[PDB]
Amino acid sequence: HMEGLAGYVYKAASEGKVLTLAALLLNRSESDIRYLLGYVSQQGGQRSTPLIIAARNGHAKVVRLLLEHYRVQTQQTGTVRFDGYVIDGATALWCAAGAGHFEVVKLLVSHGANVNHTTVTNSTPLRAACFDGRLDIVKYLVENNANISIANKYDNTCLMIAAYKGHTDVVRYLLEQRADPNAKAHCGATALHFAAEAGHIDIVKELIKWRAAIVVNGHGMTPLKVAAESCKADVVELLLSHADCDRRSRIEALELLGASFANDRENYDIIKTYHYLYLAMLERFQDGILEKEVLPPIHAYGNRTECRNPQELESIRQDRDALHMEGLIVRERILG
Amino acid sequence: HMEGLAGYVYKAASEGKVLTLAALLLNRSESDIRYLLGYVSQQGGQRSTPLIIAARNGHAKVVRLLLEHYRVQTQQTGTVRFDGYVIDGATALWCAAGAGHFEVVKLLVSHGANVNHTTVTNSTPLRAACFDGRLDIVKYLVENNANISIANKYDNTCLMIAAYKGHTDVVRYLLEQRADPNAKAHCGATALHFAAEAGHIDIVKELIKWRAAIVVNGHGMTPLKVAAESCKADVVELLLSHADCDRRSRIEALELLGASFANDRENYDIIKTYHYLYLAMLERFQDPPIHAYGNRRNPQELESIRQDRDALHMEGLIVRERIL
Ligand SMILES: CC(C)(C)n1ncc(Cl)c(Cl)c1=O
């Protein structure tokens, strides 16, 4: 019969009804108080504890009570639903971090919760807050000895995800806490790779100030080819305004940028196509003698052949259709 | 000294102040009037003739005088700027068509303009009106013997450009002729292919019934189900209804949109990735690649997808890599 009361207790905890929760908990034996609070409930996909669901919903009142008066264990783990995806191996500290409930986080940390508890995929509660972007929590966790080096299943640092999610504030903070910006992932990607693809120019600048290495992913893409391919012209100029395998890599990143202005249907500007593509050809002709390794015609892309001469390119500056197909040919060479 | 007056005449023509032009043009000999109206002027990038510059800016008023009073030749050619690229081989008939100046269009063709005259890229005024999408002009050109079969270089028919530019209205009307057209010849694409790429579900229905023929579903380098890559689920299901080619016998019609729903960062839904991709395992089990830098996952037999993790992202990429 006590299986039902555990649900009533869960309800009140998930609803933040501290009086409703407190009313249920008294006039119960120590044997019972443990059971009701250690019970795991299956609300759809989510499988949680009264403590966990309260910290998930930011009900600091229920959280304070469960920790102080009824000394509930912070180590309790559950499977919580964030967005549509289900995260397993989560603790009340982790949910509170992912949902941005600063006071509940402090409550859990203050009452002795493990800041470095790892989820099933080794997502630390610090990572949840870097995904979410709450600098106050991010600061508080690291100040309470949460480890920044604890990465994903796939070695996705807290720096990486924050750079991906565009949190310039936490990214800088993580970099002012000496976070290794040259750390890479299974994908082979650095935080500069994620920022360049996502075009977060402020973070790309921040990762530069902190002397990030120009490394290559598991496709042969530097952060400049990633940003050139992602049609993020802003981050292309900045990344080019420093280091690069100059000449060869620089023309290939300008040719990729120009190609993407014809492919990517969101930012499709064929005027920006000719600008970058012609700039590339001109840089190819400094000692002229820079190799145009063109490929034979295909049945797709018409039967055209990629221009090798700056006069060939000048002759399709006023052809919208030829310039489009040329951007497809360009992409084909650099990427295949 | 007479080159200077040619500029004043151009100016008044370009601004459409027809009354101002007569003051310059009157009291002049045949020798001069020929030069004054045939001068080519370089106003920025565009280098054109007064008759054209009037028709480009839609000044029907100056056009009436220049075409009616002195039957000047519509064949005069120039290079006009249409907001972006500069087009060469344009005639007043073409510019007025491209600029959507219906009044100038009617006047130009009525006075004997070459209605199927092609630009440098063999763009007919009919192409211009379907590109920009003015059905009023599109129709009017067709009754006046403009040829719908003309198309440009690379064989992009007027149907194709309208099919791409989503001008459903012109498409329905335009089916007074060819459906499944020039196969883009160069691109290898049908007018319905451009429709599927752009996901204009409205015309793709037309390409089959209510005007257009059946249109060949054949292209090779991706069937007309290009929309699976273009993340156009709307037309993807639509094409799937036509069966025995894309459904009943066609077991291979595993379009697997979900791979594209993880790649395109504009329409990226990894929930939609697993949804369509799981149909593949379910359809594959009614009755494979390599691990590049630690990959597949792609198998449908393996658990029929464990789900939940972001790993599906890289898994959606493996699918795209396999299908190419
Ligand atoms: C766009 C694409 C697929 C080239 N790409 N973008 C970003 C990153 Cl971080 C990597 Cl590793 C990558 O390969």
DSSP output for A4-52:
HHHHHHHHHHHTT-HHHHHHHHSS--HHHHHHHHH--EEETTEEE-HHH
| Torsion angles phi and psi, residue B223, rounded to 5 | -65, -165
| Torsion angles phi and psi, residue A298, rounded to 5 | -120, 170
By the 10 Å C-beta count (0-12 exposed, 13-18 middle, 19+ buried), B251 is classed as: exposed
End-to-end CA distance of chain A: 65
- For chain B, helix (H) and strand (E) counts, in that order, are 17, 4
How many CB atoms are closer than 10 A to CB B212?
A: 24
| Torsion angles phi and psi, residue A312, rounded to 5 | -65, -45
- Residue B227 DSSP label: G
Q: Do A302 and B220 touch (CB under 8 A)?
A: no
Size of interface A-B (CB pairs under 8 A): 55
* Concatenated DSSP letters of A233-254: HHHHHHHHTS-SSTTHHHHHHH
How many CB atoms are closer than 10 A to CB A71?
A: 10
Q: How far apart are CA B161 and CA A80, in angstroms?
A: 50
**In units of Å, what resolution does this entry have?**
3.0
Alpha helices in chain B (DSSP H): 2-15, 18-25, 30-38, 50-56, 60-64, 92-98, 102-110, 125-132, 135-143, 158-165, 168-174, 191-198, 201-206, 233-241, 258-263, 270-284, 311-323
Closest CA to B128 of B92, B99, B169: B99
- Angle at the Cα of B152 (from B180 to A311), degrees rounded to 5? 135
Determine contact, residues B65/B104, Cβ cutoff 8 Å.
Answer: no
Partners of A86 in the β-ladder? A81
Owner of token pair 């009361």: A5
Q: Two tokens at B137?
A: 């002009």
Q: How far apart are CA A152 and CA A161, in angstroms?
A: 10
| Torsion angles phi and psi, residue A164, rounded to 5 | -70, -45
> In order of start, what are the domains of chain A with their CATH numbers?
1-150 (1.25.40.20), 155-244 (1.25.40.20), 248-336 (no CATH)
Q: How far apart are CA A130 and CA A181, in angstroms?
A: 15
- Does the beta carbon of A219 sit less than 6 angstroms from any atom of ligand 1? yes
Q: Two tokens at B200?
A: 């204009």
Owner of token pair 């390794």: A293
Q: Do A271 and B84 touch (CB under 8 A)?
A: yes
CA dihedral of residues B251, B254, B255, B257 (deg, nearest 10):
150
Closest CA to B221 of B252, B189, B244: B189
- Residue A219 annotated in ligand binding: yes
All residues of chain A having their beta carbon less than 8 Å from the beta carbon of residue B266 are 265-266
Determine contact, residues A325/A301, Cβ cutoff 8 Å.
Answer: yes
- Does the beta carbon of A217 sit less than 6 angstroms from any atom of ligand 1? yes
- Among protein residues, the one whose CA lies closest to atom 13 of ligand 1: A219
Instruction: Report the Cα A114 to chain-centroid distance in Å.
Output: 24
Could you tell me the sign of the dihedral formed by the alpha carbons of A55, A56, A59, A65, in that order? Answer: negative
CA A153 to chain B, closest CA, distance in angstroms equals 10
Q: Two tokens at B135?
A: 């059905």
Q: Two tokens at B36?
A: 């004054």
Q: Do B221 and A300 touch (CB under 8 A)?
A: yes
Distances (CA, A) of B88 to A166, A316, A318, B130: 45, 11, 8, 19
Determine contact, residues A65/A19, Cβ cutoff 8 Å.
Answer: no
Q: How far apart are CA A192 and CA A222, in angstroms?
A: 9
Q: Two tokens at B302?
A: 């393996």
Q: How far apart are CA A215 and CA A183, in angstroms?
A: 10
- Does the beta carbon of A71 sit less than 6 angstroms from any atom of ligand 1? no
Q: How far apart are CA B219 and CA B196, in angstroms?
A: 12
Q: How many A from CA of A231 to the centre of ligand 1?
A: 12
Instruction: Report the Cα B250 to chain-centroid distance in Å.
Output: 31
The three-class DSSP label of residue A332 is: helix
CA dihedral of residues A99, A103, A105, A108 (deg, nearest 10):
-140
Owner of token pair 């449908």: B300
Could you tell me the sign of the dihedral formed by the alpha carbons of A174, A179, A180, A184, in that order? Answer: negative
Determine contact, residues A24/A36, Cβ cutoff 8 Å.
Answer: yes
Owner of token pair 């996502």: A198
- Does the beta carbon of A52 sit less than 6 angstroms from any atom of ligand 1? no
Query: Rg for chain B (alpha carbons), in Å?
Result: 27
What is the side-by-side strand order in the sheet with A77-82? A41-43, A46-48, A77-82, A85-91
Determine contact, residues B74/B93, Cβ cutoff 8 Å.
Answer: yes
End-to-end CA distance of chain B: 66
- Among protein residues, the one whose CA lies closest to atom 12 of ligand 1: A226
Determine contact, residues B169/B198, Cβ cutoff 8 Å.
Answer: no
Closest CA to A228 of A207, A204, A259: A259
Q: Which residues contact A218 (CB under 8 A, 6 or more apart)?
A: A186, A187, A188, A189, B292, B293
Chain A: residue whose CA lies nearest to B186: A302
- Pairing status of strand A77-82 against strand B46-48: unpaired
Closest CA to A206 of A233, A179, A244, A246: A179
All residues of chain A having their beta carbon less than 8 Å from the beta carbon of residue B154 are 302, 321-322, 325
Distances (CA, A) of B61 to A24, A230, A313, B104, B170: 88, 49, 40, 9, 28
What is the enclosing helix (H) or strand (E) of A336? none
Q: How far apart are CA A126 and CA A117, in angstroms?
A: 9
Q: How far apart are CA B45 and CA B49, in angstroms?
A: 13
Closest CA to B160 of B193, B202, B199: B193
- Angle at the Cα of B216 (from B213 to B222), degrees rounded to 5? 140
